[PDB]
Ligand code: NA
């Protein structure tokens with residue numbers, strides 16, 4: 001599924017991401033734009049042979065099992081395929097475990113480089129939540 | 130789809146029913162419980178040969194076309210079948226036209242007899258919206 005900006009903001013709000021670990025909704029919408037262009041089916045190979053999956057490009061090295069990342073961990077206890085569903089629940093619940101692990105949203109390179117320190121409120125302006 | 134109480138409250142909130150024409154979310158959840166038991170696929174024949182459809186039991190006499198209610202109107206400009214979808218959008222948009230037509234939620238008999246004058250806030254207690 002490719003989400004509209006305001007549709008994803010509402011969905012992320014429903015799943016309890018607004019101010020989760022103190023990250024406003026705008027931070028989460030900004031991260032998803034730059035990670036996946038709002039596409040739940042986004043996949044990208046990493047140089048190290050791991051793959052990033054879904055709206056927030058969750059990495060098979062640490063977080064999910066895709067059967068072809070040798071010597072990786074599955075800290076969210078899910079098949080990476082679960083992170084590609086039109087249903088964003090599995091991506092949100094895993095994102096909560098990642099952002100809670102001591103590096104906050106710095107775990108997302110695109111958040112660090114394109115969202116952090118910016119007016120992220122602009123990502124949710126004009127949306128009914 | 131059979132909704133959970135809190136799931137439907139959130140969905141109705143997302144579709145802009147909270148305080149629509151001044152009816153709190155609890156009024157809408159209470160009406161859906163007593164009309165359909167939260168089942169989007171609910172259908173009931175009326176004595177007059179019309180049929181009520183969906184989570185809010187919208188009547189084919191006035192509001193939707195089902196092809197077998199002779200001399201009825203289609204004021205919501207939809208096939209009644211649209212009101213049975215797991216997607217509550219068509220039911221919500223038609224419910225807005227009904228509640229705006231001068232009788233407010235008295236259009237729903239079950240609301241008048243079981244919700245009106247009661248502590249409807251109890252229908253949304255314990256829900257994350
Ligand atoms: Na893995």
Ligand code: NA
Nearest residue numbers: 189193201202
């Ligand atoms: Na009709």
